[PDB]
Amino acid sequence: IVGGYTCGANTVPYQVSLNSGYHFCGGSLINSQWVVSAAHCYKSGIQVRLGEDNINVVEGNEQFISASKSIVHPSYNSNTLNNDIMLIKLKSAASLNSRVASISLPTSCASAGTQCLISGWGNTKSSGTSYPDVLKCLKAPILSDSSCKSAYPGQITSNMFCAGYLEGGKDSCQGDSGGPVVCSGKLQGIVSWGSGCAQKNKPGVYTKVCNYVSWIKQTIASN
Amino acid sequence: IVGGYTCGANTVPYQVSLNSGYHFCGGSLINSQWVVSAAHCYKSGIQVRLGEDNINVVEGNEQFISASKSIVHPSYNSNTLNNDIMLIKLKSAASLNSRVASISLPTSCASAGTQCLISGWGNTKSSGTSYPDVLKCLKAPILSDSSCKSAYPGQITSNMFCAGYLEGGKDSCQGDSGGPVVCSGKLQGIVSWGSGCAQKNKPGVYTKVCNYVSWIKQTIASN
Amino acid sequence: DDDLVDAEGNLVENGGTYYLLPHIWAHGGGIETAKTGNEPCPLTVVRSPNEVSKGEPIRISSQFRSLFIPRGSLVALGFANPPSCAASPWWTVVDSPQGPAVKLSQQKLPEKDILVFKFEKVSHSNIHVYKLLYCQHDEEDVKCDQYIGIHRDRNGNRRLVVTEENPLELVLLKA
Amino acid sequence: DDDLVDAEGNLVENGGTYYLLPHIWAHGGGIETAKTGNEPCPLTVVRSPNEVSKGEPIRISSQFRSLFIPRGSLVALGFANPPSCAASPWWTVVDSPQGPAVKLSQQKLPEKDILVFKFEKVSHSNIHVYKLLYCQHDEEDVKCDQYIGIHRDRNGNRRLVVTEENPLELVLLKA
Ligand SMILES: [Ca+2]
Ligand SMILES: [Ca+2]
């Protein structure tokens, strides 16, 4: 996250960290056994680390549970960054407490102006690199669909949506992928792509979760 | 100075610092009564700090003497950055010693390829901001006149000469202005200007002191 | 005096970001960009129509390696947060139907096309106001005997151009 | 654990710098630039003539906000230190007499013109090598069914172009 702030240990209970010997993506908990991240974050043998803050130090609230099945979206297209949604089922049900909780699926597709919280352990510099130990947070509003298409000519599809600041300086970044976008208690988006980070007229693009509520439930029932 | 190293306290005894509240330009002690710096470094309340290292702390070997006179070369042209040289007469004579020693003026100009020492308390990393507490050094060879003029199209006069590295990464910078450029124990250049700092094909440009030896010996003998 | 200072009387930080605002006895706001001609993004340097806007923060540079902008030094002027479609953020004076115009470019500009500005104090005090000069190369020596002014165009943009009269006046505020 | 990996077998840092070396060095060295035709400066993307040079360090970026380039992602490729005359350091595929060629531009090119590359792993049992695909938008999808290759011109230069044969074999070495 660029231009954000330190969230606070376990202040974002649904934020999980996809680990592969080290942190590589974010994820979101939607129930004791299912984590929703992005498709491009798909790997083999992913280990889901719950209840984190400092991902490089053990503080006592963690919960590491290896992935038993990693289901990437069937229509996912890497060339178009389209349908960038993945479903991860844990092999062991997470223990739900105050530091490890599920975020509920969206019930609407939030309009422009809606206020959200984007979080993750990604890079904190638009120019240069600097990766945090603790989870960072960013309060950002969903931008107009038209502002989105103008900023990313011929790239925006109905399965995506921009959030952030057209002027720059505040945004999500590399290492935030598969991360959560919670607008008023509900999971509206997943940190997907963008051009650079916190650049002018180059907002972050997020997978529009509201379009997959059906897919997520066909999946969770038959698995 | 970028790509340099910490010189070591009072290792550059001729290096002075011009203060007007804080440090704004370097300077070179040519005798116990005069200092030579750049013309664009002219101010009317200059206090010369001699025997310095950490310009932000009183390490005990400093000497603070005001300037009674400040004489800018009569042919200095701010628009063309030409004849960028100035003479400063200290109110009282500086006590000469190992921590505060004058530097010799040249008798002949330097030859390209000759390695010199450029020092100052300028910005250490240009592509951001960071200004040293302690004095920094850098070994830089004079560059051929052709590559200098080629570097800066239509800007090089005979009172200028380049030095440093055409690859970049090691050059002087904002804050080093007026400072010294000594080769074979002789003051050949004064930190003057350049496009950016340590950029490829953008070497430091320095006032060619050797062309002003007679003017200096003439000014010190009249004021 | 010919020394360059901001609103608070402070010298200008070489490379420092500033707002180029008007003094109270003027209309409009700070310096902005506009999309004129075939420009794909806003590449025209203009004076904001909104008396309330500070405009875009402007990066002011001098080749002299001093911490401040020296007196009578030429300066490069550029948007610290330029639009994506401009090769660099430096302003440049280009020929056009409206006369010499201050624009951003989609092409890298030779240093001689950007090292073309110079501020000028405006005699009387109370406010630290400066006018802007456009300089040119008479090969060796550089001359700055032409001001930058405002020329409102058809669409309402107050374009910054080299005008015979109606000189542009600025008060620099640290950003 | 995805497809794109360097010489040491590590995932490629998104936005990181790498030397684009060849599998078979009789083909040339790393990638760099040259001035061909009427170009005012080195704007042609070529494989170096020098059988020993590592070429220029090349930035490899994906719009995906991941730490490393996802398997099958499109990429932009640019020189970490391009020649002054180029607007942006990114590669682009312009139309040419002898076919679509990889070049640099003096004009800032919109993203669609630089988000046109994709790596394809070569099945060598041991040593990580990739070919390079060229991609262009079609029916609301971007297709990558054309390879990049080398066309030796008269003046010798080993030009990277969209040919159907002499495909590029690439080995990435972190810089
Ligand atoms: Ca931990
Ligand atoms: Ca001291």
Please, are residues A168 and A96 in contact by the beta-carbon 8 Å criterion? no
Residue C150: closest CA among C48, C52, C79: C48
**3-class state of residue B82 by DSSP:** strand
CA B115-B118-B124 angle, 5° bins: 125
Resolution for this model in angstroms, one decimal place? 2.6
**One-letter identity of residue A67:** A
A46, A100, A109, D36, D66 from A12: Cα distances, Å: 21, 8, 22, 56, 20
Place of tokens 């076919």: D99
DSSP E strands in chain D: the ranges are: 16-22, 31-34, 44-47, 57-61, 76-79, 92-94, 101-103, 117-121, 130-134, 136-137, 142-143, 149-152, 158-161, 170-174
Look at residues B131, B77, B37, A167 and name the one whose alpha carbon lies nearest to residue C13: B131
The SS3 of residue D86 is coil
Helix, strand, or coil (residue D111): helix
Which experimental technique did the depositors report for determining this structure?
X-ray
Q: Which residues pair with C11 in a beta bridge?
A: C5
Chain D closest-CA separation from residue A162 CA (Å): 14
Residue A194: CB partners within 8 Å, gap ≥ 6? A171, A172, A202, A203, A204, A205, D63, D65
Nearest CA in chain D to A131: D67
DSSP annotation string for A24-63: EEEEEEEETTEEEE-GGG--SS-EEEES-SSTTS--S--E
**Spatial contact of A131 and A200, defined as CB atoms under 8 Å apart:** no
Enumerate residues 6+ apart whose C-beta is below 8 A from D24.
D169
Write down the residue that tokens 């806007």 correspond to.
C53
How far apart, in whole angstroms, are the C-alpha atoms of residue B192 and residue B41? 9
Q: Which subunits count as partners of chain B given 3+ CB pairs below 8 Å?
A: C, D
Q: Which CATH number fits domain A1-12+103-210: 3.30.1050.10, 3.90.380.10, 3.40.50.300, 2.40.10.10?
A: 2.40.10.10
End-to-end CA separation in angstroms for chain B: 33
| Nearest CA distance, D84 vs chain B (angstrom) | 9
Q: How far apart are CA C120 and CA C4, in angstroms?
A: 8
B57 is in an annotated binding site: yes
- For the CA atoms of A167, A171, A173, A177, the dihedral, rounded to the nearest 10 degrees, stands at -130
Rounded Cα gap, residues B15 and B27, in angstroms: 6
Give the whole-angstrom CA distance, residue C22 versus residue C3. Answer: 19
| Contact between D131 and A92 (Cβ < 8 Å) | no
A40 is catalytic: yes
CA distance linking residue C146 with residue C57, whole number of Å: 24
CA D26/CA C104 separation, integer angstroms? 45
Neighbours of ion ligand 2 (CB under 5 A): B 52, 54, 59
A134 is in an annotated binding site: no
In order, the DSSP letters of chain A are -BS-EE--TTSSTTEEEEESSSEEEEEEEEETTEEEE-GGG--SS-EEEES-SSTTS--S--EEEEEEEEEE-TT-BTTTTBS--EEEEESSPPPP-SSS---BPPSS---TT-EEEEEES----SSS----SSPEEEEEEBPPHHHHHHHSTTT--TTEEEES-TT-S-B--TT-TT-EEEETTEEEEEEEE-SSSSBTTBPEEEEEGGG-HHHHHHHHH--
A22-40 exposure pattern, b = at least 16 Cβ within 10 A, e = fewer: ebbbbbbbbbebbbbbbbb
Using CA atoms, how far apart are residues C30 and C108, in angstroms rounded to an integer? 25
The token duo for A166 is 């057209």
Task: Label each residue of chain C as H, E or C.
Answer: CCCCECCCCCECECCCEEEEECCCCCCCCCEEEECCCCCCCCCEEEECCCCCCCCCEEEEECCECCCECCCCCCEEEEECCCCECECCCECEEECCCCCCEEECCCECCCHHHCCCEEEEECCCCCCCCEEEEECEECCCCEECCCECEEEECCCCCEEEECCCCCECEEEEEEC
Q: Say which ligand is closest to the CA of A56.
A: 1
Within 13 Å of residue A27, how many CA atoms lie on the same side as its CB?
A: 36
Q: What structural domains and CATH numbers belong to chain C? A: 1-175 (2.80.10.50)
Write out the two tokens for B60. Answer: 């005990």
- How many Å lie between the centroid of ligand 1 and the Cα of residue A99? 12
CB C65 within 8 A of CB B37: no
Q: Annotation-wise, does A54 bind a ligand?
A: yes
Please, are residues D136 and D108 in contact by the beta-carbon 8 Å criterion? no
Q: What is the residue whose two structure tokens read 């959560």? A: A180
Q: Where are the domains of chain B?
A: 1-12+103-210, 13-102+211-222
Q: Hey, how many other C-beta atoms are within 10 angstroms of the C-beta on D10?
A: 13
Question: CATH second-level architecture of B13-102+211-222?
Answer: Beta Barrel (2.40)
Handedness of CA B147, B149, B151, B156 (dihedral sign): positive
Q: Are D161 and D98 in contact (CB under 8 A)?
A: yes
Q: Which residues pair with A2 in a beta bridge?
A: A171
Q: Which of A98, A123, A33, A118 is nearest to A71 (CA)?
A: A33
Q: Do domains B1-12+103-210 and B13-102+211-222 have the same CATH topology?
A: yes
Q: Which residues contact C105 (CB under 8 A, 6 or more apart)?
A: C43, C86, C87, C88, C90, C92, C94
CA D34, CA D42: separation in Å to the nearest integer?
4
Question: Which residues touch D88 (CB under 8 Å, ≥6 apart)?
Answer: C87, D78, D82, D105, D108, D109, D114
d(CA A168, CA A3): 9
